[PDB]
Amino acid sequence: KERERLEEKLEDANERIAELVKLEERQRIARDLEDTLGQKLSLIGLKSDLARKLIYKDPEQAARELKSVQQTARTSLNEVRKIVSSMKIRLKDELINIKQILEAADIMFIYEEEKWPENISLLNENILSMCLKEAVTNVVKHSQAKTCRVDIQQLWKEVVITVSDDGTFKGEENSFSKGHGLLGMRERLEFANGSLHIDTENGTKLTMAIP
Amino acid sequence: GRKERERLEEKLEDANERIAELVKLEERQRIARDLEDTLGQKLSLIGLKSDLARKLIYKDPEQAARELKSVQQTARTSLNEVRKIVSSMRLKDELINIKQILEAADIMFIYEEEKWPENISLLNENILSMCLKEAVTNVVKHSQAKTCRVDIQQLWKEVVITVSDDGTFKGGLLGMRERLEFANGSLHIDTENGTKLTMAIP
Numbered sequence: 001k002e003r004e005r006l007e008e009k010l011e012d013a014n015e016r017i018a019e020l021v022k023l024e025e026r027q028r029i030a031r032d033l034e035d036t037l038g039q040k041l042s043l044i045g046l047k048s049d050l051a052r053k054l055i056y057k058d059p060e061q062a063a064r065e066l067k068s069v070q071q072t073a074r075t076s077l078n079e080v081r082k083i084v085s086s087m088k089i090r091l092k093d094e095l096i097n098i099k100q101i102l103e104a105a106d107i108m109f110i111y112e113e114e115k116w117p118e119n120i121s122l123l124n125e126n127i128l129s130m131c132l133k134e135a136v137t138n139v140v141k142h143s144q145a146k147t148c149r150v151d152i153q154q155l156w157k158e159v160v161i162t163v164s165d166d167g168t169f170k171g172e173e174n175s176f177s178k179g180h181g182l183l184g185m186r187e188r189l190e191f192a193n194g195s196l197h198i199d200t201e202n203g204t205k206l207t208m209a210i211p
Numbered sequence: 212g213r214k215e216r217e218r219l220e221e222k223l224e225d226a227n228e229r230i231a232e233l234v235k236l237e238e239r240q241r242i243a244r245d246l247e248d249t250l251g252q253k254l255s256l257i258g259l260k261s262d263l264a265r266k267l268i269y270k271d272p273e274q275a276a277r278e279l280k281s282v283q284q285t286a287r288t289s290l291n292e293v294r295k296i297v298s299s300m301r302l303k304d305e306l307i308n309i310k311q312i313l314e315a316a317d318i319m320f321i322y323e324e325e326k327w328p329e330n331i332s333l334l335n336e337n338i339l340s341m342c343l344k345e346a347v348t349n350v351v352k353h354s355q356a357k358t359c360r361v362d363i364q365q366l367w368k369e370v371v372i373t374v375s376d377d378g379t380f381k382g383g384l385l386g387m388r389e390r391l392e393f394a395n396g397s398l399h400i401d402t403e404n405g406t407k408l409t410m411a412i413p
């Protein structure tokens with residue numbers, strides 16, 4: 001009846017982790033909104049007040065300011081749908097989308113369909129997807145690969161997706177773009193007590209694990 | 212036992228995963244809903260009214276400027292909407308804000324400061340706050356009360372905030388209560404003597 005106390009303190013902690021990362025989500029999200037979006041909207045107000053001043057005397061230019069308000073409302077709307085999506089992907093869907101990305105990059109898509117996992121949640125599933133997006137985006141974008149092999153495997157407690165490629169690695173200890181592509185991926189695996197692994201030994205072999 | 216009894220534990224850790232994924236899902240779904248709807252609709256509006264004003268410039272300028280007063284205000288309103296959402300993204304703070312709400316409604320604020328709890332998280336704390344907002348908003352707004360008493364109590368596993376008032380019951384609150392039910396806390400209301408609200412949270 002002491003080891004069970006150990007379980008009450010440790011559980012307190014395994015709930016705490018959950019809340020203080022849901023907060024990662026929160027703050028980062030209000031950051032995007034606040035910044036990108038709100039700045040766009042301020043811009044819209046100012047350019048439309050300006051065009052409103054121009055109407056009578058410089059109309060040719062009021063219409064230009066207004067072409068600009070038009071486009072900033074556009075871009076703001078795209079930013080919104082971008083968020084929304086960063087909140088709404090499908091696994092078997094990402095498979096098709098990257099299938100197209102590489103097919104298009106003139107890269108060979110080796111996928112040997114296996115056992116589609118059962119022990120996976122949908123926060124987990126969506127994270128997995130994302131890491132798919134950035135791993136393939138990075139392969140296409142950099143590797144120099146001519147082949148990419150994607151293994152989705154139910155394995156034990158967790159799904160594992162390895163994304164391998166033959167190309168050469170362009171990465172130096174800076175490359176790890178502080179809070180960007182691969183760092184986003186890997187911190188994002190570390191939080192859900194999964195993990196990201198990379199073996200540059202033979203081209204570049206990526207590896208994602210998630211309960 | 213340990214092996215068979217053990218595996219159930221799993222049946223429960225994981226049963227529990229399945230459960231709290233519904234807070235993520237339909238927290239982010241309320242959020243994408245608000246964005247999508249309110250905001251995106253506003254932005255479409257902006258595009259259309261500015262394309263229109265752009266057509267008017269030359270022939271009907273007096274009215275291009277009117278459409279444009281409109282684009283101006285819709286950018287405003289859109290920005291405020293973004294605000295609501297960033298803000299949603301403090302307990303002792305809510306205390307001051309409602310202190311003002313009721314003080315202003317000509318309602319008496321009985322608060323007898325107690326033991327500020329320790330066993331509380333901040334998802335919990337912020338939920339508590341919110342329910343404060345809607346309970347007091349509802350009291351001011353409806354009760355007919357002339358007094359409101361707020362008890363914040365560390366109690367056992369969980370903080371408990373009762374918001375009582377003398378007024379009559381005329382029966383927001385579903386948001387409050389489902390939102391307590393999810394964090395295995397609870398909402399209780401006793402209309403027996405005016406209206407007495409009660410929130411509990413681990």
Ligand SMILES: Nc1ncnc2c1ncn2[C@@H]1O[C@H](COP(=O)(O)OP(=O)(O)CP(=O)(O)O)[C@@H](O)[C@H]1O
Nearest residue numbers: 139142143168169170171175176177180181182204
């Ligand atoms: N498959 C690969 N082949 C060769 N080089 C690679 C590679 N994958 C990654 N790299 C190198 O490592 C660097 C770090 O990648 P990372 O994804 O962190 O930044 P990035 O350049 O992909 C933009 P983002 O911030 O969107 O990821 C890359 O810039 C690239 O130079």
Ligand SMILES: Nc1ncnc2c1ncn2[C@@H]1O[C@H](COP(=O)(O)OP(=O)(O)CP(=O)(O)O)[C@@H](O)[C@H]1O
Nearest residue numbers: 349350352353354378379380381382383384385406
């Ligand atoms: N403190 C209170 N005392 C007596 N009746 C109350 C009350 N708070 C709410 N009610 C009654 O219950 C109804 C439901 O409350 P609820 O909070 O869902 O709606 P509301 O009328 O407060 C506006 P909103 O839902 O937008 O906050 C109210 O219409 C009111 O008649």
Ligand SMILES: [Mg+2]
Nearest residue numbers: 134138181182
């Ligand atoms: Mg990258």
Ligand SMILES: [Mg+2]
Nearest residue numbers: 348349383384
């Ligand atoms: Mg109400």
